[PDB]
């Protein structure tokens with residue numbers, strides 16, 4: 176078998192096989208916290224995939240702390256609680272949120288940190304008002320719909336030792352950044368950053384370039400992959416269910432999508448996909464996959480089929 | 487005001503080296519003197535010795551990691567090298583720094599084997615540059631074939647056994663036709679060059695979406711104030727004149743006839759009109775992408791050291 180990439184390859188079996196000295200199981204409580212998270216997520220999927228994943232990440236995080244100690248000694252450094260940041264990328268409705276939320280659950284179970292914050296990139300979009308002014312609100316999720324000078328600043332601050340760093344928050348009810356709903360990140364041990372753009376660089380923002388990227392401040396990055404045809408279906412389904420804020424909202428900017436019949440809805444969904452989002456993926460997201468530390472490849476039902484980890 | 491870098495002035499740095507009294511054999515002292523000779527042993531002991539001590543903590547910490555994971559996943563084999571990249575402007579001391587660290591880093595039993603590849607060999611051959619009218623622009627994103635360079639480190643971090651790299655000659659001042667070097671699974675590979683910290687963002691004419699930085703474990707940027715960089719650049723030109731003194735058919739043969747005052751006038755024009763711009767827009771902007779920053783004074787003496795938090 177001849178290939179050889181910068182990645183170690185594992186098919187489902189090989190992954191769900193990895194056992195570590197001292198058995199991996201999940202207590203009652205954990206088992207609960209997760210069904211509330213997605214409930215479409217099977218416990219077997221969690222045990223076979225994410226449990227071992229979290230185990231993997233812990234080795235990485237732990238090795239880091241060990242290093243912190245050695246160095247803190249060598250150069251004599253007071254304190255400064257610099258959190259370990261793990262980012263999660265991928266296309267729309269790929270499971271970015273779910274994965275993040277799940278890892279945050281499991282990762283807390285380690286006495287080495289146990290403290291894990293989670294910030295989703297959506298909060299860093301330009302408020303609908305600004306988007307309307309730039310004629311971008313059918314383009315939410317494109318490099319121009321993001322204020323990532325602010326985002327890079329966020330993780331930059333976190334990695335700078337700034338104690339309490341605040342972050343904007345996006346609402347899935349009114350689908351707009353919450354006016355005065357910014358969240359305060361109080362020195363966490365681990366910060367998980369979920370979003371479509373966590374892997375992008377200034378090369379993706381020529382209209383307003385930046386020279387130090389989000390990745391420059393992220394310790395470990397995870398990209399959630401899936402074949403195009405699948406991404407299409409998942410996108411469509413999200414639309415079907417959310418109609419892009421069409422619902423929850425007096426008469427959302429896209430209130431008109433409410434009246435759409437199923438046939439019309441999916442008809443619309445894939446015009447939006449084929450003409451907008453499919454290109455966002457193809458040219459702004461997909462190209463960053465190889466920039467990830469670990470790549471998860473899913474099957475039609477979100478089951479993880481492959482796992483690639485940088486050598 | 488806080489930042490992503492820890493700061494140390496010459497004093498503080500030359501201070502954490504007392505930890506584990508570190509000396510060095512007489513032959514290595516010979517070695518180094520041969521490398522630069524303008525490099526004082528004092529500077530080596532005060533700066534680069536503890537620098538290498540630092541890198542070792544990072545590298546060894548990593549090997550322990552490897553073991554741990556190697557177990558958990560039962561991967562085995564594969565000799566993935568630890569890559570350190572060194573960036574900076576022209577005549578800033580990239581080569582020297584790289585060659586020096588290569589010396590010191592090998593004295594650790596965990597490593598001991600450290601290759602050194604310099605970015606220059608990845609420039610397009612003069613023939614090609616001439617075709618694109620870029621050979622007064624050697625060092626600019628377009629004078630580089632970095633799809634090749636990116637592939638080089640990608641290959642290395644892919645586990646590919648023997649990976650070759652093109653080599654640049656400082657005699658002919660061109661990439662040597664059949665002079666490619668083979669990198670035979672070393673422990674540490676040091677990549678010295680001007681562009682080691684750039685991204686596709688600097689290559690719009692032919693972008694790439696996975697950067698050299700994505701395959702480098704530790705990056706060092708050598709900094710110095712503009713006025714100094716100019717001096718150093720000019721001094722280099724005065725000394726070498728783009729190989730007009732070693733290649734009778736050098737493309738810049740005419741630089742030979744220049745008298746010192748003419749040479750300096752020339753260099754300062756090249757800098758002010760070309761290289762000053764390369765630095766200002768393709769090189770300096772990448773400084774903050776470095777893991778560690780070295781700041782030198784008029785005499786290449788390192789006055790400050792910043793390491794990412």
Ligand SMILES: Nc1ncnc2c1ncn2[C@@H]1O[C@H](COP(=O)(O)OP(=O)(O)NP(=O)(O)O)[C@@H](O)[C@H]1O
Pocket residue numbers: 213215216217220266267268269270271272273274413476477478
């Ligand atoms: N591991 C998983 N198992 C089963 N279903 C999943 C899984 N991950 C995601 N899903 C399904 O996919 C839908 C979207 O998951 P979600 O985590 O919200 O994705 P996302 O990428 O964060 N979405 P978005 O930010 O809106 O582009 C859920 O409602 C689930 O039905």
Ligand SMILES: Nc1ncnc2c1ncn2[C@@H]1O[C@H](COP(=O)(O)OP(=O)(O)NP(=O)(O)O)[C@@H](O)[C@H]1O
Pocket residue numbers: 522524525526529575576577578579580581582583722785786787
């Ligand atoms: N630590 C140092 N101490 C003393 N002199 C130094 C030092 N580093 C560099 N130099 C001087 O600077 C000159 C150039 O050093 P060098 O390491 O070749 O720089 P460089 O960045 O690799 N040059 P180039 O690749 O041609 O842009 C040497 O000839 C020395 O005179």
Ligand SMILES: [Mg+2]
Pocket residue numbers: 271272273295
């Ligand atoms: Mg989400």
Ligand SMILES: [Mg+2]
Pocket residue numbers: 580581582
């Ligand atoms: Mg050199």
